[PDB]
Design a protein around this ligand. Structure first.
Ligand code: GTW
Ligand code: CL
Ligand code: MG
Ligand code: MG
Ligand code: MG
Lengths: 244, 204, 243, 224, 241, 196, 240, 219
């Protein structure tokens, strides 16, 4: 029968690792680097696009930074299509929670949910896991500003600064070196871009190879605003910080 | 017994010159017993306003449902829903409960952000669209509102002329209905400002 | 290679080796035949007497479908029974809806499509039987033979099992020597002979002859087993021809 | 739940010394309209059983097909289908009884009253009733619907208890049945003159008589 | 090498089970041809009855799908009959749901979409058949549409299928290069059948008797297959000129 | 409705009025109640128009698919398909259908399927609301093996009376003749049949 | 019959590759060249009608498909796979969008829906990925003109201009030189015909080329999708 | 509602009034009841307005998908079947009463479809509460093979009969003329009633209404 052709995606190796999770992480290690940095007055999400031609329409393009609700965004590293499946599930969970309790979903609860979905693919069903790692940038009125990551295993953790995708080893050392707890958004913007500028496999870091976003409470009357940066704005912030 | 007239209340909407107005009373009751005088029946999803009369549990449920749907719409489309599009969404959503309907009388109001055209619409409980330019009425004093609107209304009113028209239409209709009144709200909606006014009316 | 390990896999030839392996089980079985006559059909089969302990005339191989169709098969006997059970369900549903008893060509395709379905998936095994069947319908007599692949055709005579080549040669002589046709009682006698001649390929053990027939004149278009005097008359005719 | 539309009236029957007799008129009524005058309501099964059916005719036709199908099915892989493993009256009855009670229990009954008359392997007379409720009973005389009220009283005067069955000849029994069919024709508004009668004897086998008529009709006292 | 056993991609981007199903197509060793007239579509196919014990009337690879649609199959008979039964069912369902007779191309596309599913889903094997559908469509006129195990389908001016398809194809190509029209400019179907048979004789280099051919003809509002005697009449007319 | 099918020497003729009412309103006065399920197997429809239309379409489908596989179906087979639908869905249907057809073997055949879902094979059949009024007339005037002209006159006279007395019936008398010769449609207007 | 293939046939290899997606992309590479170019007042999509036989009527085989009145699609790779994506794209544009909102979906969202279907064939039990890459051109009121590519993985990217299949590497280089942000639709059609001539071996005319545009409304609106006729292509080939 | 259709020489003329009622009250005096099915097929709607609207839209949508797959214009019989089979399945609970008219490859066809799933194929039909008023006009004046402007007048006259004599019907007269060469969607064809002129201005002057509080938010 069919047993002959079954890869068995949900088994342990003799060492006690999940083959497909490990190989999915290997996939994600080749994806464009995404960085999240949490400041006292906001969060920065920066991410590097990949391959890019001069003919790619950048202003209508979204491969890295996605919006889950008005308070929570994600940076993606891995299969974009796999991410979009999970993103739309998350977007629904947030609205189910809003409908039930008449309050916006707390960031951790959303993150756990998605992470639990990812976990399920590693323990049952016989399907391949999602080849995606998320950085979640969000705000709620319990914990304030929060950064999390999840990976194909379904494990998630909280961070002050973090990278996913390519060159995370190098990126995490550079962040660990220059990050400080009293840091502000404008400084974190600069740190994020400087880290990508050194870890990039491209010759130089330009506006057309970047997606960029900030979650600031820095708004009138203490309300959270998500800013997905336009191509021209990423170009301006690259000149301001002195990279180009 | 009749679900559309347990809780009571009304909504009316009108068009003017480069503006729309939508208004509602504030009553919620259990038939004869008045319970709340802070039960607003007008909601908004971006720049599109939705009034809903009828069974209050369904009014609440539908508001929550259209908030849900319009939020996902905005995330996917990367723009706020327009009145024309929303009207169709309401109709769809009502008709998918054709044989177990929401006991409601919805009313859409808003200005199309691109064309600038003032828009209103109304529905029966199963989603048939009343698509009239002049005015839309709904609730336990709908007959009363139809009469008031037909005699008071005229086209192309300026925002503060239209306010006086819709307010007098609501107030005088509500005062001839046992299950409407207990306060009232009037939204005057323009292309980039919305004025919300609470009206002084008799509290019986 | 590996193309023969799984059913419904095309080899590089364009063949389904599992079906061809089912044919080997069919070729391993006892001899069964079918003869189309003037107004009907005759079926006969070789039943190997493995032991003296077998009760004579009790282990019946030929099966009836509806009241007008006879089925006989060579190979894996249970697979044949399974196919006949399905046939009976098909014939029953046909009669329930359309009132008339199932026509033989209609019935042939019902078995055909079902057997062919067991070559479409790796989760099932092909049928280990070639099935000779037929009867009398409104358009007269029909004889069919159905292979593990789902292939079937109409026949003047049919033969399958270990003695098929021997039988086929004898059937071909009858087709040549009787263009105007063979009578039902003649076909019973000839069937007996052909099973007796085809027994030379299974000559180690002795055997038991079993014959059935549908004929418009001799059985009113209903399937009946050849019994008693008519069976003995056919055995005597067969025994005379080998000597 | 339905309602019966085209209907058949009384089926009547009795035991006698060697076998059983059963009879039923050839009418399919459509309410008060005497719609179909050529309806056979005695349906033989093999050469040892006759199933007489009253009530809804569409449901009778369904049961007719079930019995026809039962014969086909019993023949399958059965070398003794015309001998020791042929269908018995008791088997045919029990099947029908099972069906009738199953159908009432799903609230979707076959809207009939049935009498299975036959002779068993060992020569025993079989006569048993079943209806739309699955209710079953046996008696030396059995009759459905209207015949229960008028035929049984007459037939019971011939065979009043079990001990009268050996004393009753086939002639006496057939006369009684035909007499009863006359009485029913005078008095049942939904009956007809034309009927069928079936004798199942342990010696002479199944005799099926068609196109019989009620005769010797007393009307002369009307003129006064 | 399990990429050759089920319908998944090989490293070259190839589905070997689809390719091997195409080879099963020629296992019968039969050549078919289809051409269009003005008022008709004619399909002819080789008939080979190797066994004398066979009833030759039951040996057929032409199928009457609906009254308007005919289908000839190149491939083994069990898969041919699988395909035939389904096409019949689909054509009947179509007429019930949509109230008009299923067009030839709409059936071809439908059967092609089903064939595609077997190339993408692993548990189903492709059928080892090429299906040539013919009709006189009430909108498009004389129609020839062909389906294969890949799930490909396309309309034809004329076509040929089988082991010696390339010979027949080039013969037909050369004729339409001369005439400079998409059809056989002929009033009667009887003469279009004569054309079809003649051009198969020339291409294959073999003479035919009445029992070596099998013919199907589509006209407006009916498709029908010719008897042995109808073909014999057709062969007499060819010989006499 | 007034409908009938009558066997005769050369085959069978179906006949029907053309009136369809919604209460007292005549919604359609030119209704075609004789519907084709196969070349030479037709039916007369009475009862719910929605039900008899839905059934006749399903039967047409079944017989089309029968024909694709097993060749021309018998009139008995058509009647069996009608019955199967009417009997199994008796609780949700109001259909009284007469099935009529011409084989060459069996010649003309008429099957009636009343409300129950029972089948009755008859030399002729009458049905519909207007049929009550002509049981007397039809029983007295029907003979077997009539000629085509006699059978047309028998149906014309019968339905003429059915129409006269039944308000639910009326309009034109349509007929469909089924013989070896083919299928002939006849129509007869009020000015013709009323003066009979 | 049990569909026992409830497990993924596309899995991660030790290197992190998804074999079946890569192999599907190899199938796309072997397919015939198709391209898309975006102008200021329109979009053009084009491909070669590679006729399998001269007896075949290549007009019946449409490589360029209308998905909605304002959205068109072309492909490179396996035709039968494309056909069933076009069917589902057309259907999803009604079920999940038009029957809800009373209007057709914008280009990007229809693209996203197609991408989803393709992704699911990359992860669901018992299926191979689709062996096609799509180029979807379209217009909608709030986004204007747009051009998207969709790959077997489910990944999609918006393009100013691009090409896929056989001679895509050479074609993309050709387009990079010629493209600017001030092209009119006629200029883009001209460039599309030049670019496509490089990858075509044999006959190059209106009968062997399929070319459609998303442009002005052709007379509630008119449809912006328009397939150019065999004559309309040949006219522009004289000014080539 | 008064909806009607006739078959004329070159094609089909459909007609409808424009009054939408909730009980005894008029909600819309100029509503559209002639619905689009396909470019060559339209559908007049009566009965439960929501059922009419969503049944025509669903079949229109499915026919659009059907027509994209086949590449040819859809037929009226297929529109008729799809409406019929759906309405039948729902046993009259979808209260759609349609006049379906269009022009095929096989010529012009006109149907009446009823909520329970019956359809009549006819040269002229009327539906809605004003069907008897409209049908009287057709029985009085219809003849087969009319010219275009004559058929337009007859339908317009039949809808008018409904407008005036039936209380459920009113407002303007919409027509839809369908032939092989054109589709003319005439809305409104006629305005048989002028809107009643008001003699006084009852609009209140600014500051007349009593306000408690106010809030302004920009967008
Ligand atoms: C005339 C048909 S009539 C008088 O012969 O029944 C119109 C037809 C029509 C068609 C399309 C459009 C626009 N999409 C408008 C009008 N039908 C009506 O006006 C409906 C008549 C009702 C009669 C009583 C039984 C229900 C149907 N009216 C409605 O459908 C209204 C919707 C309007 C726009 C407010 N709905 C109701 O009155 C309902 C009350 N309760 C319901 C569950 S629906
Ligand atoms: Cl399909
Ligand atoms: Mg009050
Ligand atoms: Mg497969
Ligand atoms: Mg009358």
């Amino acid at each position: 029968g069919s047993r002959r052709y079954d890869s068995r995606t949900t088994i342990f190796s003799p060492e006690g690792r999940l083959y497909q999770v490990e190989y999915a992480l290997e996939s994600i290690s080749h994806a464009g680097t995404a960085i999240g940095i949490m400041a006292s007055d906001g969060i920065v999400l920066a991410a590097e696009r990949k391959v890019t031609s001069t003919l790619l329409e950048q202003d209508t393009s979204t491969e890295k930074l996605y919006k889950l609700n008005d308070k929570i965004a994600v940076a993606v590293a891995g299969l974009t299509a796999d991410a979009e499946i999970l993103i739309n599930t998350a977007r629904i969970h947030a609205q189910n929670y809003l409908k039930t309790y008449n309050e916006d979903i707390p960031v951790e609860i959303l993150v756990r949910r998605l992470s639990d979905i990812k976990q399920g693919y590693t323990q049952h069903g016989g399907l391949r896991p999602f080849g995606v790692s998320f950085i979640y940038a969000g705000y709620d009125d319990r914990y304030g500003y929060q950064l999390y990551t999840s990976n194909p295993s379904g494990n998630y953790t909280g961070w002050k600064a973090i990278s996913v995708g390519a060159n995370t080893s190098a990126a995490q050392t550079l962040l660990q070196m220059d990050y400080k707890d009293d840091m502000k958004v404008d400084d974190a913007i600069e740190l994020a871009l400087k880290t990508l500028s050194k870890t990039t496999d491209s010759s130089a870091l330009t506006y057309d190879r970047l997606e960029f976003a900030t979650i600031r409470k820095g708004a009138n009357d203490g309300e959270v605003y998500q800013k997905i940066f336009k191509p021209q704005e990423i170009k301006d912030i690259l000149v301001k910080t002195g990279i180009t | 017994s009749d679900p559309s007239s347990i809780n009571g209340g009304i909504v009316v909407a009108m068009t003017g010159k480069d503006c729309v107005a939508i208004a509602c009373d504030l009553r919620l009751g259990s038939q004869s017993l008045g319970v709340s005088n802070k039960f607003e029946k007008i909601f908004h999803y971006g720049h599109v306003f939705l009034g809903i009369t009828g069974l209050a549990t369904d009014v609440t449920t539908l508001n929550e449902m259209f908030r849900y749907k319009t939020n996902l719409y905005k995330l996917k489309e990367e723009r706020a829903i327009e009145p024309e599009t929303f009207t169709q969404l309401v109709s769809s959503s009502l008709y998918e409960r054709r044989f177990g309907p929401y006991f409601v009388g919805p009313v859409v109001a808003g200005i199309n952000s691109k064309s600038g055209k003032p828009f209103i619409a109304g529905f029966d409980l199963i989603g048939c669209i009343d698509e009239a330019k002049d005015f839309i009425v709904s609730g336990t004093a709908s007959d009363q509102l139809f009469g008031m609107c037909e005699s008071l209304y005229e086209p192309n009113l300026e925002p503060e002329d239209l306010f006086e028209t819709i307010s007098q239409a609501l107030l005088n209709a509500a005062d001839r209905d046992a299950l409407s009144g207990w306060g009232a709200v009037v939204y005057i909606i323009k292309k980039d400002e919305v004025v919300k006014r609470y009206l002084k009316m008799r509290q019986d | 290679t590996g193309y023969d390990l799984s059913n419904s896999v095309f080899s590089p030839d364009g063949r389904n080796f599992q079906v061809e392996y089912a044919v080997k089980a069919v070729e391993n079985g006892t001899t069964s035949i079918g003869i189309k006559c003037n107004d009907g059909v005759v079926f006969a089969v070789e039943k190997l007497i493995t032991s003296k302990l077998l009760v004579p005339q009790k282990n019946v191989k030929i099966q009836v479908v509806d009241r007008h169709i006879g089925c006989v098969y060579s190979g894996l006997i249970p697979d044949g029974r399974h196919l006949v059970n399905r046939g009976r369900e098909e014939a029953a549903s046909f009669k329930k809806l359309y009132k008339t008893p199932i026509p033989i060509p209609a019935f042939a395709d019902r078995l055909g499509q079902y057997v062919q379905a067991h070559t479409l998936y790796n989760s099932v095994r092909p049928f280990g039987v070639s099935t000779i069947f037929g009867g009398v319908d409104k358009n007269g007599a029909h004889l069919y033979m159905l292979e593990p692949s789902g292939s079937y055709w109409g026949y003047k005579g049919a033969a399958t099992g270990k003695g098929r080549q021997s039988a086929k040669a004898e059937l071909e002589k009858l087709v040549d020597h009787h263009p105007e046709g063979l009578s039902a009682r003649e076909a019973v006698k000839q069937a007996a002979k052909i099973i007796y001649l085809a027994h030379e390929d299974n000559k180690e053990k002795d055997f038991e002859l079993e014959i059935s027939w549908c004929s418009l004149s001799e059985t009113n278009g209903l399937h009946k087993f050849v019994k008693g005097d008519l069976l003995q008359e056919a055995i005597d005719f067969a025994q005379k021809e080998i000597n | 739940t339905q309602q019966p539309i085209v209907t058949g009236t009384s089926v009547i029957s009795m035991k006698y010394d060697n076998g059983v007799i059963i009879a039923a008129d050839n009418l399919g009524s459509y309410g008060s309209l005497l719609r179909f005058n050529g309806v056979e309501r005695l349906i033989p099964v093999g050469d040892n059983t006759v199933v007489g059916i009253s009530g809804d005719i569409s449901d009778m036709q369904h049961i007719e097909r079930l019995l026809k199908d039962l014969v086909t099915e019993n023949a399958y892989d059965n070398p003794l289908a015309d001998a020791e493993e042929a269908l018995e009256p008791s088997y045919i009855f029990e099947y029908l009884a099972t069906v009738m009670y199953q159908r009432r229990s799903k609230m979707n009954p076959l809207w009939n009253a049935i009498i299975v008359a036959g002779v068993q392997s060992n020569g025993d007379q079989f006569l048993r009733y079943v209806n739309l409720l699955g209710v079953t009973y046996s008696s030396p005389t059995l009759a459905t619907g209207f015949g229960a009220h008028m035929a049984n009283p007459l037939l019971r005067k011939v065979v009043d208890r079990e001990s009268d069955i050996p004393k009753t000849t086939v002639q006496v029994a057939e006369e009684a049945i035909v007499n009863a069919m006359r009485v029913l024709y005078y008095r049942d508004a939904r009956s007809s003159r034309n009927f069928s009668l079936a004798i199942i004897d342990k010696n002479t086998g199944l005799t099926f008589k068609k196109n019989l008529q009620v005769e010797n009709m007393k009307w002369d006292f009307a003129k006064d | 090498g399990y990429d050759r056993h089920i319908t998944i991609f090989s490293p070259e981007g190839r589905l070997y089970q689809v390719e091997y199903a195409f080879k099963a197509t020629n296992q019968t060793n039969i050549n078919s041809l289809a051409v269009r007239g003005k008022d008709c579509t004619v399909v002819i196919s080789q008939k080979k009855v190797p066994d004398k014990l066979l009833d030759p009337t039951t040996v057929s690879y032409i199928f009457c799908i609906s009254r308007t649609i005919g289908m000839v199959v190149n491939g083994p008979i069990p898969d041919a009959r699988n395909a035939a039964l389904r096409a019949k069912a689909e054509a009947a369902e179509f007429r019930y749901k949509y109230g008009y007779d299923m067009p030839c191309d709409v059936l071809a596309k439908r059967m092609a979409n089903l064939s595609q599913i077997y190339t993408q889903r692993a548990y189903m094997r492709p059928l080892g058949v090429i299906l040539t559908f013919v009709s006189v469509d009430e909108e498009l006129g004389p129609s020839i549409y062909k389906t294969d195990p890949a799930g490909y389908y396309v309309g034809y001016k004329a076509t040929a299928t089988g082991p010696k398809q390339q010979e027949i194809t080039t013969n037909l190509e050369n004729h339409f290069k001369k005439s400079k029209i998409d059809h056989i400019n002929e009033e009667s179907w009887e003469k279009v059948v004569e054309f079809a048979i003649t051009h198969m004789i020339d291409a294959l280099g073999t003479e035919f008797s009445k029992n070596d051919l099998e013919v199907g003809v589509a006209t407006k509002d009916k498709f029908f297959t010719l008897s042995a005697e109808n073909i014999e009449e057709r062969l007499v007319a060819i010989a006499e000129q | 409705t007034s409908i009938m099918a009558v066997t005769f020497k050369d085959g069978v003729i179906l006949g029907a009025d053309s009136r369809t009412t919604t209460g007292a309103y005549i919604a359609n006065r030119v209704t075609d109640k004789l519907t084709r399920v196969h070349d030479k197997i037709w039916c007369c429809r009475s009862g719910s128009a929605a039900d008899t239309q839905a059934i006749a379409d399903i039967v047409q489908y079944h017989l089309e698919l029968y024909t694709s596989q097993y060749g021309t179906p018998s009139t008995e087979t058509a009647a069996s398909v009608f019955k199967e639908l009417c009997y199994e869905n008796k609780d949700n249907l109001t259909a009284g259908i007469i099935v009529a057809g011409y084989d060459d073997k069996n010649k003309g055949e008429v099957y009636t399927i009343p409300l129950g879902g029972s089948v009755h094979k008859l030399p002729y059949a009458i049905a519909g609301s207007g049929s009550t009024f002509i049981y007397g007339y039809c029983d007295k005037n029907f003979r077997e093996n009539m000629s085509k002209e006699e059978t047309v006159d028998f149906i014309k006279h019968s339905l003429s009376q059915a129409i006269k007395w039944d308000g639910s019936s009326g309009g034109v008398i349509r007929m469909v003749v089924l013989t070896a010769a083919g299928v002939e449609r006849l129509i007869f207007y009020p000015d013709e049949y009323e003066q009979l | 019959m049990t569909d026992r293939y409830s497990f993924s046939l596309t899995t991660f290899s030790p290197s992190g590759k998804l074999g079946q997606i890569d192999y599907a992309l190899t199938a796309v590479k072997q397919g015939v060249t198709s391209l898309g170019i975006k102008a200021t007042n329109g979009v053009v999509i084009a491909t070669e009608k590679k006729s399998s036989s001269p007896l075949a009527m290549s007009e019946t085989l449409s490589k360029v498909s209308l998905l909605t009145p304002d959205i068109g699609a072309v492909y490179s790779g396996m035709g039968p796979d494309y056909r069933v994506l076009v069917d589902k794209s057309r259907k999803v544009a009604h079920t999940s969008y038009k029957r809800i909102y009373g209007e057709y979906p914008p280009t990007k969202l229809l693209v996203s829906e197609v991408a989803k279907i393709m992704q699911e064939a990359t992860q669901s039990g018992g299926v191979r990925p689709f062996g096609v890459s799509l180029l979807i051109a379209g217009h909608d009121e709030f986004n204007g003109f747009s051009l998207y590519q969709v790959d077997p993985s489910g990944s999609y990217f918006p393009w100013k201009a691009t090409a896929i299949g056989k001679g895509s590497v050479a074609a993309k280089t050709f387009l990079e030189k010629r493209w600017n942000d001030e092209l009119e639709l006629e200029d883009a059609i001209h460039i599309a015909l030049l670019t496509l001539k490089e990858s075509v071996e044999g006959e190059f005319n209106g009968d062997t080329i399929e070319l459609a545009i998303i442009g002005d409304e052709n007379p509630d609106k008119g449809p912006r999708f328009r397939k150019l006729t065999s004559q309309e292509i040949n006219d522009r080939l004289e000014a080539l | 509602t008064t909806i009607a259709g006739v078959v004329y020489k070159d094609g089909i003329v459909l007609g409808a009034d424009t009054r939408a009622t909730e009980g005894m009250v008029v909600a819309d005096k100029n509503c559209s009841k002639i619905h689009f099915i396909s470019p060559n097929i339209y559908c007049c709607g009566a009965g439960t307005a929501a059922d009419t609207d969503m049944t025509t839209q669903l079949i229109s949508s499915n026919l659009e998908l059907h027509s994209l797959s086949t590449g040819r214009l859809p037929r009226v019989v297929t529109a008729n079947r799809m409406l019929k089979q759906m309405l039948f399945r729902y046993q009259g609970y979808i209260g759609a009463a349609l006049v379906l008219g269009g022009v095929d490859v096989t010529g012009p066809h006109l149907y009446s479809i009823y909520p329970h799933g019956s359809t009549d194929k006819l040269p002229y039909v009327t539906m809605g509460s004003g069907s008897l008023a409209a049908m009287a006009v057709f029985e009085d004046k219809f003849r087969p093979d009319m010219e275009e402007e004559e058929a337009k007048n007859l339908v317009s006259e039949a809808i008018a009969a409904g407008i005036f004599n039936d209380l459920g019907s009113g407002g303007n007269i919409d027509l839809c003329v369908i032939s092989k060469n054109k589709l003319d969607f005439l809305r409104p064809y006629t305005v048989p009633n002028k809107k009643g002129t008001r003699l006084g201005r009852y609009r209140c002057e600014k500051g007349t209404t009593a306000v408690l509080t106010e809030k302004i938010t920009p967008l």
